[model samples]
Target chain A: LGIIGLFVPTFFGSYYGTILKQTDLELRAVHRHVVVATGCGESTPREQALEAVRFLIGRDCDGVVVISHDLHDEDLDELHRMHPKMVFLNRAFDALPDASFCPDHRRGGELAAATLIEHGHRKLAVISGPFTASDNVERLDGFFDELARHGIARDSVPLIESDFSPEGGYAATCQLLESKAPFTGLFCANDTMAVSALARFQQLGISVPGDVSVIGYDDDYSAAYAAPALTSVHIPTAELTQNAVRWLINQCYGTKWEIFREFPVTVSMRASVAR
Target chain B: LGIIGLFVPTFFGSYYGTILKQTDLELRAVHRHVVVATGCGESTPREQALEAVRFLIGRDCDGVVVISHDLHDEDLDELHRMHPKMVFLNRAFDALPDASFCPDHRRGGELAAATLIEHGHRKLAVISGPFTASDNVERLDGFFDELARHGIARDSVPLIESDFSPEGGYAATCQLLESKAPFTGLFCANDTMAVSALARFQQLGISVPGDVSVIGYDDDYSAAYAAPALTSVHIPTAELTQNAVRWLINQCYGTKWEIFREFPVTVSMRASVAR
Candidate 1:
């Protein structure tokens, strides 16, 4: 097997992925050499990842595969353009010659809207990430599609645009509340925004699920630990990582091929959502 | 000026510092530099901080200064031990050779305490930060000191400890509110927590600065634009960055001498605090 290079933070996506498959990949580094490159952000981590790929290739290995949060990340794209035969996990755009694996964001959004509807909330306000980003727009598409299936019209509700930051959620929440538009539910694009919105609701004396129900995406660890525990969409982060590793290994040793991958999203019912 | 080195992230402390004095110091670069050497913990933005320090020393820079958040970052001790001549900003510690600067947290705390006291809030509750961190502890200390000057004892009120994260603050707020401690005012260690508390209070149908005044630190941008226009203590971030750059320049090129600098804090009165 070829060496699968991993570049991630100590306490971030890699941390969780490692924890989920510790026993499987821990001492097995000898048999199927998988090394983690230390770094953050696409600029540096991409370089590190490419260097790792270069390392294995220099040893007479095959092509390289990279796993990235966003395929359009400048570093990732640069690497792909340089090595057109490379593969990426989750997030594929431009219909590149290579294959990609990504989560079914449409399903995740549908579940979120359905979950809120089950909780007796109709007047929904959404705080989506930058619509310019494909992921945010895709998630919104799935959300609205699901809502429409349920005979819900979102025209009257406000859609707050933010950059998937806590500050963005906080500002959006304040605006919705001040409008007193009778918004009782909020669907944030990510968990960070949901946590921020939840806090804002609390400060405004509007109880979660009591006055407003909140649901978030990315069901990261912090979400499950949030007060009243958050209701979130669980992306197959671990499975995605494993698949990326497998793809990288194949690219490094097997014949070069173009393929794409994506994981489905599911909901983790928690306190933030009331039925 | 001895080839001064500046590193920072795009939107963090680096943004303001760069605008005020266009420099290349970046918080994100820390990870890039670190990963090139240590080859670990590269996926996170926060951990990249210490790694960057390591990278600078490895590259043979004379003196480096960090003006980002969290002075006592975990890697700080190792970096200090490794480079005795290094100058750090935020004083992340008790003593340093270079002029380390942090917002007047203690005075900020004092201001918040005094604001509450002036508003007829004799019984107060403080949602504090971790005791291990000097910055958080000092702010709490200032609060106690101010209250004691008015003959108010710490035992007379409730003080909750949290991680300074929004969720941490929310949990602390929940516990305090559920306890029915009868406190008429709330003070948080930072604006993130304060904002969360503000939201929580409103969700619970509690009036802020009415039944219980709410105040914050850091005066982050979003706080000012918050729905109610958060009342906060604005830290001298621009000045702090200037001092950091000055100290770094002095150490790298100016006449060799001991560097020690401390600046005053300013309070911004807002609607959150009321009598």
Candidate 2:
């Protein structure tokens, strides 16, 4: 029997889509042959990397699929040595020299920035996810690069490095509010952080979109229900799941190369960001 | 292999600790020959019920452990008829009759009501969750029963049926605020709604624990982080999981019996509720 696998660093981590999606797929199968690859729940990131390497080389099943934030070239080389046949998903392990995917974060950043600026926001700030995650890093870079074209210096705007944590968002706002960062806009890397940001702003006697306009990535459902509703980017969870599974199946059945798949990402706008 | 079959209803339906503890135990390999019986993630709840029933009967494994909330009796009966030979970890199908692990909702309700009454609150209000679920109904009953003990008629306080929705909480509060009810105390069934109530109270320029006392359930992480840290009843996620799983394992190795294992609940006092 063949099955798709998950190699997440954290057992109870933020890979909900990867874990639940894989579990759902496993349950809806003809002959059950799937299991999530997990380690000690408290294992460190380096330990996780080591575990992934061990799993790829020693595991006796079909090929392996990995989800990583970006790894260094040396790490990628190490992983490649272990499992040259492994299929890496998500941006973390996509260190393959010739990997390409549809949708451009640069374009997405340009779009979000232009929308925010169009709404009359000149002062800008961003709360980013962990630097290891390709998505947040890409979005952050694209946002700053886009602002450069508008004669804005990246040095002038506030940039907070977060691991996509809600707590991080709250702390970042407190720090920014305490600083002379004079900003009327915020771009959080995720909806959860955005919600935290909104809550913090409300606590600090600051009004949303009234004084500070906020935008977020990953247009989640809570975004719609949030007070005033969040203006954010939406990624297609269902379609993306189907696509990833389809790619995995092709690898299991056909003679297709595991490296041929190009994961696509898109952005949907909601009410959180406003002019 | 004679596995201690642990059945989770939803793929991920916040069991609190119902299945989590069981899963954790099995993952640790402390209990071998383990089986996890679950339902498909389909839109139709009835369809999911039927699938869960089939899984229990088809396996003909050692014993089965499960948690059923909104499933109908007919569905339970069908499974009972098919798996007459298989042992159920929690005795019978119906929670009250068979003894499945459950939160002390009645106690929760009573605690909530008493806390309000102790604060000199004459006019009280309850924003209850859907009455269809056992926990919701029980908690609601517990609250009313406690109020009745204090010589207060159910008519003395307004009983509002809420889906525990944030928007619904807001709308319900708006209605209560506009009504001739003139409530001095508000108790919502869950934290989400409770926070929503807190926000509504804030909007009305009312101070909590001073002008009106407030309380909520499911002591979530955000509860402490609320403007005034929310007072809540802890669901005992880790404890519940352990107890539920331990009961399941005991059933697995023991003789057949018509029984269900149920667990008691505990509460956590915080700053949200006051005298």
Candidate 3:
């Protein structure tokens, strides 16, 4: 058994962090001698990712896993050169698609929209992260595709771009509300934004599921604990981690193995959505 | 242009992270030529701190700022020796006291207890992080001191130790509720725990403020949006960051500066408390 390294862009408070820790714990249970080193990128994900990779390399890690979305193609190529045994998680790389593992973000988006539509909501709105993020792009594309299939014109539904932050979510909701667009259902790319939208609605004296319904992705643990319990799309982060780690470990041991690079996402039905 | 390194042992979702980002933004506005490097310890704070310091050192940073509670005295000494321009935040170091800056945690605790008592709450219970944490110790001490002054025995008020996590807070609250000890007021050491406790209370069919009032330390932005809008002790994290940054920047520039090593905390009253 050899040491493995996990690199993340932020702290342990978010849903992603918790999922990463759980995945790490599972790895520890199965491989007693396998040590895992974790590195975080606080501000610049690119800088931290590079630093984390270098630090893990210095520690003689047999394999490395990166959980970041901001890394460019050149950075990925550089990381690949530094460590041939590397597996990417969260965001997929166009240059090295086979080395990447990610959730079916598009399908998750499709499911979120389908759930809202099934609940008898025709007028819909969306809040998404920056357009540059591939995950957000996929999610929005899938959502729009589903809406278009239902004969809802893409231009008719209002869309707001946010930073995938609570404050950003709140501000986006405020912006949407100010537009006076009559939307019965709202879908946020992630739960942080969804929960923040929930609070914003409350602050604005708008009733949740009463006046409007909301849905979020990622099924963050707090989603179940939100005031009305958020309805969210669940990405099996643990499964993704497990598959990626297994593949990485096999690579370290010079063992050829087949691994599923894409994990399916499911819906976590909660109270945030209503008819 | 010199590179400034920020070392943190946690993620970017907490009040601390927000404050750090705000401080970084301020630095960017004034010092356009300066660059910032951030390193996070995603797993064990201790291991990550050392790795982050080494990584920043290798990057030839002009100054280093550490935001962590797990750094050992020896580690601080080593860091100080390696980077003479290093400054500490959040947690204070007795060995290098002058190089550290922090909030008055004890005062925040005192304010929390005082707020509850002023609201006519007695028969209080507490949920705190591990006792080994100095921040927890200070908060508990001040809380108990205020309670004792009001003729309340420390033992009479039930207390549970947690891991400074939402799951820990929820589990501890479950244990507290199972103990059959009735409490009219509940205080958690931090906003994360408090929000989790609020959620747990909801799950248990307990009505907040109506059945039992609640308070938490650290007025994390989301706290104000928590279901009932949490009544919390506000640690001025921005001020703390501002002071710490000023001190660190001064050190980097070899400029004479006099900054308070400790910042004050106050209370943010919301709907979580009931009369």
Candidate 4:
């Protein structure tokens, strides 16, 4: 009898659309609400968030599920004041009015680091996503903290910052290699980066798993299909989205629900990490 | 004003959309016309082509530009018999009523082989696309024939047929490597296969352009971003589409135009091949 608004930054053009569709189907199973999915194409993230908030509020949506990379605490506070029935997905915040669901990105990074460390790789390098991204920050924290636990000095490992693309990964790898820093293992923030790193290493005459082992976070389908079969951390997309929808629907209906801050992630062992 | 239908096997889900949009813009520049874009999602190729023909004809389109991988001369003949005003794009056919514009896939294959051969690679391997596809067939013919012209026997080279995907290329590379066949150069029908093959070689402890030189057809953007920055054949997407639209527009207006069976392709040199 009510409309539910789903605001994602750019799900339609990315793989996130599959997860959103699954969430939509799961939400419809629980209630007779019409789910309206919208995106802010080519718009700045903050502007898109504001636009989404205004549009959903004007439409009189019973509740909204928001997944964004650029939203700040102040933006959330204003959104909560304007519409108290909205829930957040894929980003956690303690000050939020509604439940915020996110995958344990930091733990995913630790899993990727551990996979390489367990294979007796001592000297390591890391290719990280933008430091401004919360997910990237958390993942890097877990990776560095785990390396410290293993008595590896954080300053000793080479670090390269890159965007979330194969080209970014390739460029970062080139920079890392050109520096002539000695490293036996490379851990990338994502699978696309890891796969591209594998190619860069090949081009540079460096042997993967033989001379250098590589691992990545986000076990995308590309991980299993990469030349060396990239070892990566698996984030459960369906579980996160389904749970987010369930919580948002319950909030809209004034029903009791359990709060989940973070979903679990696991490591997928592949040929990229040498024994 | 005439209504022109642009029918594709899949739209809004591939790079073809970029070409279609450009075509639409160019067609609008020349004169006033309605461009109705249609697609058959998740349907068999033949079924999609047949459905596209039915829908465009029923809509009374003045002309149609058909782009498909699975269509043949028989299909084009039948469609022409029903509608009498259609041009094919990307895949050339001999029995079509109007002209078909295609990239020179055979010349592209020759370019790839020549690049590797010029690097003094005599022991060669080839990863070809589905033999059922005319583009693949022509590409293979050119590659094998050029190698024969260079005093290399076709029987001496290892050939593997693969789907146009990273996984397919990876599997083919694994089989090629496992066969204990001696090859110093590997040429793939497309860039995806070449990039995947690079990864497979990394997994198997083979070095690219060192122990083995590799080249690919279709200089996709990823080709330049690949680990070693792949050497490939460039197929000008914008030029081909613009020309296709111009020809189709001329046919719709009952004006005579020059026919072009195929567009020229050129080699893009990269680090994947070494002398």
List-wise, what DockQ does each model earn?
0.05, 0.19, 0.15, 0.17
Query: lDDT tens digits, residues B123-212, model 3?
Result: 899999888777788999999999989999998999999977777887898999999998999999998888888877766668778898
What are the per-residue Cα lDDT tens digits for candidate 4 across A246-273?
7877777765656454567998888878
Please give the range of 10 consecutive residues that has the lowest summed lDDT in model 2 chain B: B12-21
Count: clashes, candidate 4: 4
lDDT, residue A32, model 3: 18
Count of steric clashes across candidates, in order? 39, 18, 1, 4
Model 1: share of true interface contacts reproduced: 0.00
Q: Could you tell me how far off, in angstroms, the CA of residue B38 lies in candidate 2 after the best superposition?
A: 6.2
Question: What are the Cα lDDT values of the candidates?
Answer: 0.62, 0.61, 0.75, 0.72
Off by over 4 Å in 1: A1-79, A82-90, A93-101, A120-127, A151-186, A191-214, A219-230, A236-264, A268-275, B1-81, B92-96, B165-182, B192-207, B221-230, B238-264, B268-271
Candidate 4 structure, TM-score to reference: 0.68
Q: State the TM-score, rounded to 2 decimals, of chain A in model 1.
A: 0.74
Regarding TM-score, does 2 or 3 come out ahead?
2
The C-alpha interface RMSD of every prediction is 10.5, 5.4, 8.5, 7.9
The recovered share of true contacts, given per candidate in order, is 0.00, 0.03, 0.19, 0.29
Q: Name model 3 segments beyond 4 Å from true.
A: A1-104, A118-125, A128-137, A148-163, A171-184, A201-213, A220-225, A235-261, A270-275, B1-6, B19-64, B71-85, B252-258
Best by DockQ: 2
**Candidate 2 wrong stretches, greater than 4 Å:** A7-34, A37-39, A49-89, A92-104, A253-275, B1-26, B29-46, B56-65, B72-99, B155-184, B193-214, B225-230, B246-275
